[PDB]
Structure formats: structure tokens, C-alpha cells
Amino acid sequence: HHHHHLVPRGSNPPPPETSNPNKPKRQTNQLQYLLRVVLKTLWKHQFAWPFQQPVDAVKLNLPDYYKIIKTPMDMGTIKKRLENNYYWNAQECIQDFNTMFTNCYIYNKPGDDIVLMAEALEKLFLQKINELPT
Ligand SMILES: COc1cc2onc(C)c2cc1NS(=O)(=O)c1cc(Cl)ccc1OC
């Protein structure tokens, strides 16, 4: 038979939402710090680039990525969520960072370049978290 299954093709899933009008939201001092200090310091770091947007499994040739990672998260999404006042509290935002880092550790192996990057970003994150306003 002449159907060789060359189509349909793969794709990336839809990215995480950055807007949800019926979601409860608040501005808090802790969230303002998470944007101004935590996100902005990580964003400019030389290790930020793999984490500045959703994993593009097509471009990066990671066809297994979304078979393994079912709760994707990235700093581009977190930045948009902070700019859009999406969060109710600091915990919701911190959980997004934790998810991002954990996804990287799940998908990859200790000592991989991308894991070294995530570990360094996570160390910085945890340092900035320890100065969160009370
Ligand atoms: C192995 O390639 C990757 C693994 C990943 O886990 N999480 C992300 C995001 C991620 C991205 C890639 N691909 S990559 O081109 O960004 C890449 C980054 C680094 Cl620091 C090292 C290798 C590499 O691709 C081979």
C-alpha cells in the first residue's frame, strides 16, 4: 500500500495559559518582588535561554519531550503571568518555577549541560526566595 504514514505530522502542544479572566488574582508585595527581582535576575542570566519559552520539541528535535512531560512550564509563561497579574499569591508563581526546574531534571540526566543550567538557575532562585518580603 502507498500510504507510508508521512502525514499527519507532530506538533507542539498548546502552551500554558497566561490569561484567564475568571481566575482569582491579586497584586501582593511578594508577587511584585517575584517579577522585579526574581524573574528579572534569572531572565538576564546566560543560562536562561533554554527556559525563556515553552519547549519547542519540533525545533529542538525532542520528539519524546511531551510523552514524558505532561505539565510543561517555562519562564516566558511565568513572565507573562506576572505581567498580566495572573496569580493570586506567591505560592502559585513559585510552584510554576518548581515545575519548570523539576521537568528539566525528569527529562534529562544528572551532569547534562541543561541540568547544570537548571541547577544554577535554581540555586539563584532559592537565594532570591530567601529574601522574599515577609
Ligand atoms: C537535550 O536537549 C534539550 C533538553 C532540554 O530539557 N529542557 C529543555 C528546555 C531542553 C532543551 C534541549 N535542547 S537545547 O537545544 O536547548 C540544548 C540545550 C543545552 Cl544547554 C544543551 C544541549 C541542547 O540540545 C542538544
Domain harbouring 122, CATH code: 1.20.920.10
Spatial contact of 39 and 78, defined as CB atoms under 8 Å apart: yes
What is the number of alpha carbons within 13 Å of residue 85 lying toward its C-beta? 8
Establish if 4 belongs to a structural domain: no
Establish if 14 belongs to a structural domain: no
CA distances from 69 to 5, 29, 53, 129 (A): 25, 32, 15, 25
Spatial separation of the C-alpha atoms in residues 102 and 29, rounded to whole Å: 26
Distance from the alpha carbon of residue 26 to the mean position of ligand 1, in angstroms:
34
Of 60, 74, 78, 104, the one to substitute when testing ligand 1's pocket (max ligand atoms within 8 A of C-beta) is 60
Spatial separation of the C-alpha atoms in residues 132 and 12, rounded to whole Å: 35
Ligand 1 pocket: which residues have CB below 6 Å?
50, 55, 60, 62, 104, 107-108, 113-114, 117
Number of domains in the chain: 1
Establish if 10 belongs to a structural domain: no
Range of the domain at 122: 28-132
Among candidates 104, 107, 130, 100, which has minimal Cα distance to 38?
A: 130
Spatial separation of the C-alpha atoms in residues 74 and 27, rounded to whole Å: 21
DSSP 8-state code for residue 51:
G
**Ligand 1 atom 7 nearest Cα:** 104
Establish if 78 belongs to a structural domain: yes
Establish if 3 belongs to a structural domain: no
Establish if 15 belongs to a structural domain: no
Establish if 17 belongs to a structural domain: no
Distance from the alpha carbon of residue 29 to the mean position of ligand 1, in angstroms:
34
Radius of gyration of the chain (CA): 17
**Ligand 1 atom 13 nearest Cα:** 60
Q: How was this structure determined?
A: X-ray
Distance from the alpha carbon of residue 114 to the mean position of ligand 1, in angstroms:
6
